[PDB]
Amino acid sequence: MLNAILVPVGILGVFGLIFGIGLAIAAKVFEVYEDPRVPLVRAALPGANCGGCGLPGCDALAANIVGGSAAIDACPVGGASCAAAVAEIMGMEAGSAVKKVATVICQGTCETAPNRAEYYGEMDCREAMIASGGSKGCRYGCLGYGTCKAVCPFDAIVIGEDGLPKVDPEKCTSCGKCVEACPKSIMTLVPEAQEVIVKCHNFDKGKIARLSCTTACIACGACVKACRFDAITVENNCAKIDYDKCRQCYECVDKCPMNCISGDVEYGKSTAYIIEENCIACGLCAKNCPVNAITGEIKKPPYVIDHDMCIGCGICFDKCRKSAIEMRPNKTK
Amino acid sequence: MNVKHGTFKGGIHPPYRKESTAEVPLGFGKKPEMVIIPMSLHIGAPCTPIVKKGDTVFLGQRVGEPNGFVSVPVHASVSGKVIAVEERPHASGDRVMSVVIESDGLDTIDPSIKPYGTLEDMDADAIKKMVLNAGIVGLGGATFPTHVKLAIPPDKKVDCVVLNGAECEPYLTADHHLMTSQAEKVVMGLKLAMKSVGVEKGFIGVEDNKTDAIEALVKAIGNDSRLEVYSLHTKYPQGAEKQLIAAITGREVPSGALPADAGVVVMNVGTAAQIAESMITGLPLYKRYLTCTGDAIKNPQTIEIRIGVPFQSVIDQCGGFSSEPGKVISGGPMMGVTQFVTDIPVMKGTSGILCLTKESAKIATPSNCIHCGKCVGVCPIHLQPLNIAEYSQRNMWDKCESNNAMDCIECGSCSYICPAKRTLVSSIRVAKREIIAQRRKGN
Amino acid sequence: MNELNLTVSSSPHIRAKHSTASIMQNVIIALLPALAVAGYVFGLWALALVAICVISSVATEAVIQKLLKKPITVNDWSAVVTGVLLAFNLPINAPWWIGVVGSVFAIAIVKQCFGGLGQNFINPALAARAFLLASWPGHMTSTAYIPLTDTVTTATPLALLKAGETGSMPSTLDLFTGLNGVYGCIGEISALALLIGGLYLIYKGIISWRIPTIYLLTIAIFALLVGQDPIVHMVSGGVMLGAFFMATDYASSPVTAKGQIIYAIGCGLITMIIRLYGGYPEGCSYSILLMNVATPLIERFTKERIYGVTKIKKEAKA
Amino acid sequence: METKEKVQIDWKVVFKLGLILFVISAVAACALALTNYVTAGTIEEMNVQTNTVARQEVLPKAADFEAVPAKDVEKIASEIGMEKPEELLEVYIGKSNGEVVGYTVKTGPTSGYAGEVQVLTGISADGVITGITIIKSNETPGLGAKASGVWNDQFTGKSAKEELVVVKGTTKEGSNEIQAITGSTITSKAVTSGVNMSIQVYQNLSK
Amino acid sequence: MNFMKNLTRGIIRENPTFVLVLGMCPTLAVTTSAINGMGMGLATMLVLIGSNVAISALRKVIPDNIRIPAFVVVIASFVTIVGMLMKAYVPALDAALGIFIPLIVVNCIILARAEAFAFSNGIADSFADAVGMGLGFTLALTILGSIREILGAGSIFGFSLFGAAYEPVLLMILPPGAFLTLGLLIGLINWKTKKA
Amino acid sequence: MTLIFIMISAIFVNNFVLSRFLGICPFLGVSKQVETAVGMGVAVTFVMALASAITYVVQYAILDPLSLGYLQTIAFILIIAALVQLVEMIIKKSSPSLYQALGVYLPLITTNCAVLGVALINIQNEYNFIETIFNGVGAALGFTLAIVLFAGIRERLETSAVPKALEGFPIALLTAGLMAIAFLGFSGMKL
């Protein structure tokens, strides 16, 4: 019983010791690969091979580190919080960003903007662009064959019965796969809190555009005179809104004669809706901010002010020292 | 004279319906009453109008000024009064800035037009200046400027000029009429181009279904030993500037290098005739030949017509519509472009108007590929169209590029022979456009 | 105020006249004489079996095209070709359900699981035949081929050839015509009819001379090098039907000439090897299937040179 | 110079990478051997038990069995003209009250579909076959493994005077004739060859 | 709250046969009957449980350069002990699965789970993971074996269904007849997963 | 003559993948491209060629004249694991680092079921040194040929309309079954 226990133990132990020493030696001489600082950013990435990239994959994005060949904020899909998580392994960064969704600047649906001729070929937007640009009467509108839906990886676009795409805000993750795939340059990225958008891309004059579509832009310029923040400009015979200067006052919406500007008139009307707690009867807002809207006498708390006018821009919500004014949208519907 | 023979590999044999208008005489259009002249009748930079509404113009007076080096001037076809300098519908599907002139009934010639000279005293510099001054572009279809073509860079060497007489698209006949009628002007234009470039060799290549044109050219050449005539087998892609070079000279243009790197200068016969005519008379390019034919035309014919006349005027002059058309095409059946309206004027590169009926314009829907392999056998560049089309249909541009999709000449032969009625050449065009666009946004 | 309403598309604006249905109908027309010979020799049950297979194939296809929400493309006559060629590979003593099972296997699994027409890489009829031979060997081996009225033959010519009993074999003229006691598959006995159909298909431009010519030449040279009779090897078995009709399938063959030559040489070599030293009396089906497997490897080494380029010596990516 | 004189400690970390592995292997051995000490012999018993079943089911009788010293087996294999030796494994003699009853013979024939089979048979005093069985085979479970079933029953009743021939037919014709399984003929031929060699051995021994 | 999630990952969410597609050789080899699959799954589950617990009990002293020899040593010891016991007491199952019982050491699931879950977790989680993976393996093997046996033999668990005149499909019990079957099954699962 | 016949039987007649069900997981794993299949094949060939000789020497010089035949599997797998660890060390340094795209199948070479399988087959068949080397080389070459053919077929199928639900693993299994039938044509040959 002694020998039958002793012999296999010795044989297997000698084999294991020799193999271990050999592998330990072969750790040197051969591969060392000199690659420090194990990735540690793939866990902070969450990547799904979306496409706002072009370095060969998220794993290669984690493996390309410590060479300094990539930008810190290269991935826009995750956001500034994702960038902070990724680069927080090294640190010295902080930031924030704004969420965005895809949108379609067109509202001509197969009966207000009909077709000039009949098209033969494959049902694709670029294939139709080969056939001399398409068969629609408007040369800037939607073809309706859903290339943007075909290139979407997160299943966020559907094609309606009227021929225009619809985007789900809960499945769209702020990329541009549909933006550079559209042959008409129609898909755009807009902040999620924006409701005032000019939906047209027609670069013709008034008469030709009027003959082409029902809701075309005739470049009259009546929306520019309504805006006092210089946020909407008419260029190339078409109007466009700058979302950085837009206070959402809902004036250009009512002033348009061809119904090109989106949004419904339900806004504002909160002229000095002042909380009585944190105002000292200063009375500085009674004098002037572009409308009258406040006039009275001293206005000790509680304030006695009738509300029938003013535009509800929002500057008075912040310019107060104590910010006693509260804005609540309360109108019809 | 010693007439040699040539051929190439690949190609198709269409019905070649040219017998309708080949035996009819040549017609001449009536005096127009209104012309629309666009500012872009070439490739490059469009011109700038130098006339206003209410002005009075002469015949041959310039109405557009060139912008850069690759740009030609634009002249007037009739004498009358300017009524509009707005923008008007174009053959490309959109609207282009144009000048509209209403005729006066009298063809008053601008009192600044005189003959340039003769062959023996003009030399290369003045020949090139005269070619630029008259606004001559390429009448073979692409409308590339000719004065840019005759300027060889110092790092290139050429030794021969070849004239393209191998008219190969069906239904088209105007080149046959021009060669049988005005051969001496063609020979004179060939000589002028040879002197301008500075070579001592010239070739003319004509297909063998136009034998009377071959005899006319042989008789017109005379005792000159530096000029030769070739006979080519009747096939469709024979005349595409590359198969012609391979058939006549035996050389091959390199992969993306232009014909100038093979030492050849290729020019159409109509361009040579226009060069000779403009040298002799001193008048610019304002008139050319056309073939009005098809299934819905009452009286098809080949007719000489000025530049700026609408399509509907030509159709009305050729009898009219025997039945309601289903397709109107500018050019031939293999490479033409379908139109939306009939208000389009004729241009410098317009060689025919083809109107088909509703029964002849119908094609069945595409089906599954059956792997027969005929597209591989008909390609003159020796590509594999099925693989490129299938890769392009699912947005794989890297596989399209690695399969040599950028050297397709877009001849259409692959799409003609498919039993499944697929749309191969359009898919190859989509792939080429995507590759070219990606080369700019990533570089 | 009359309008025009023209059509806009891309070039070209003319097409050729041939289509898929014309090609398939021409294949059926070419296969007709072998059907006539089979009906004359074997009787009325030889035709009925054929009908059964055809019906099954068509039915199967339609059902799938109704369930997957696809257009029903059954008027291109391709399932008819598959059913006829599958029915030609059966003995006279086979039950009615064998054709149904083989047709369902050939259409549902081989063809429609890969996308449909032209989207597979393997031959449907030969794969179905191999599946039938593996699953039910008692209904497909060496006794089902002799009619029940004859009781003297008891062996088909290839079995007698492999056993050395050459003196009891039928005459070479009889094997060429198939009219004086030659038994086997119903649509394989006569080589004259298959040759006539193949010549008709070559004349129409549907197939070419390369595959059948090189197949038969390789078989003859292999037979001559080992001291056997080449003509007897060519006019016996199922090599004429395979050479002219089954090795020339569009979806499982190379598209270039050099690949087709290599394909035919390999087919002939494997066929003769399995015939001489294998565990089967015939090796046509397995040789064709094995060359179907190897086709994508041949295609990447035998592609033509492109106009323009003048070769790069593997130094453009270093 | 050992890649520019690795600094001392680089060898110490080698030692800790060996010893641990060593002890792990030792522990593994210290298990396996012990299990062998309580298992292996028991397994052997099971084997011989099955063997004795094969020696009792083939020859159903109440008697005793005796084994040759295996030298006579090699002597019989050397003589008679056995082309392939070492194909006869065990020969036994059945004794009941002195009178010889028969012999039980085990043979392993080659030339099967998947290699070598093991066939045991038993022959009485007057030449008859009292039953055959298959001990070890590696054929296909659905095609060649059917030999250890109904097909084994038909071997009884044949006389040990002449050889046996297999036919691929339903009709069994006449004497000394074997009908094979449909779609499986090589296994039947191998079993019949083993039976024939056992018959030859019994004919030589009983003379 | 964490033991149950690891236990139930197991059969459905991360099935080794239907999702990970691992351990394919015994799956395509022994599943010609509904009895072989159950026994193979049970033996594999025992070995997996033992190896996972033993490896997770030693994830503090094993260096990263000699991990594979230690892993295979532990797995081979467990496989050898199990095979010795099965030879001692169950000879029929050992004879039916003769070559793949020594091959349990190389099964593509034990080593895959050793370097993915056991090397970085505690004893409690590894036990649940091993139990779930073994149950999923056994269930998949039993289903595949039953499906193949019914078509290729006409019986379920040795009990005949169609009579004594049935002619089976002998390709289903052959090596080419396994592949196709498994593929179809996986396709069905996909059709009921993305569409629902 | 014996060596040529044993090589022919190892490559064609008795293929390890399409007949014996041995190298299946890397067959279905890394056969998406033709470039990776060649490297996997050459690595497999190196491992089997090095393992066969060492297993032969260990079995016939130590295990047999000591009555320790119950230690075959653990010793064999220890040798194979050490070889695979050395190969894994070598590949990322000297071989291209872009070839670490297996990403699970590189440490699973020890589990390939065809290295240990061929070692056990060599031991059971009672061969010699040269016969064992030839058998290992033939098995490796058969594995390489099968995986290259599979990769080529998959590259061809990349342009086909597999509907939406079969795709990768089901279509790979169906393709493998069809190739298995075609190789089932290679049966009954006696060499």
Ligand SMILES: Cc1cc2nc3c(=O)[nH]c(=O)nc-3n(C[C@H](O)[C@H](O)[C@H](O)COP(=O)(O)O)c2cc1C
């Ligand atoms: C398919 C195809 C066919 C062509 N056929 C002709 C033709 O018949 N005649 C011709 O003059 N140019 C033809 N061309 C144009 C030539 O390629 C080339 O541009 C022309 O000879 C230049 O003439 P130019 O110098 O007068 O512009 C064809 C081009 C293509 C792509």
Ligand SMILES: Cc1cc2nc3c(=O)[nH]c(=O)nc-3n(C[C@H](O)[C@H](O)[C@H](O)CO)c2cc1C
């Ligand atoms: C020349 C030619 C040969 C064909 N050969 C076969 C054949 O051998 N087997 C078959 O099932 N179908 C055959 N077909 C028809 C079949 O539907 C098609 O070729 C594809 O194999 C189906 O994917 C053939 C068709 C043609 C045109």
Ligand code: SF4
């Ligand atoms: S955009 Fe970001 S998440 Fe998407 S694939 Fe690129 S790196 Fe990954």
Ligand code: SF4
């Ligand atoms: S938005 Fe652009 S891509 Fe989408 S359907 Fe309209 S034209 Fe096509």
Ligand code: SF4
């Ligand atoms: S809708 Fe456009 S931006 Fe949104 S996920 Fe889809 S492709 Fe990306």
Ligand code: SF4
């Ligand atoms: S006019 Fe404006 S809204 Fe109408 S189709 Fe054109 S782009 Fe769209």
Ligand code: SF4
């Ligand atoms: S008011 Fe409306 S139509 Fe006028 S310019 Fe503004 S957007 Fe265009």
Ligand code: SF4
């Ligand atoms: S909503 Fe108000 S701020 Fe915005 S563009 Fe219109 S007028 Fe200007």
Ligand code: SF4
């Ligand atoms: S603090 Fe604000 S609310 Fe109060 S008086 Fe001043 S401006 Fe008005």
Ligand code: SF4
């Ligand atoms: S700041 Fe703007 S919103 Fe506030 S009261 Fe003045 S005008 Fe109205």
Ligand code: SF4
């Ligand atoms: S269009 Fe392009 S691909 Fe088609 S035949 Fe012509 S050159 Fe070849």
Ligand code: SF4
């Ligand atoms: S011609 Fe059409 S059907 Fe034939 S191979 Fe080419 S693409 Fe396919």
Ligand code: FES
């Ligand atoms: S290779 Fe055999 S189980 Fe994975």
Ligand code: NA
């Ligand atoms: Na197996």
Ligand code: NA
């Ligand atoms: Na074991």
Ligand code: NA
């Ligand atoms: Na295993």
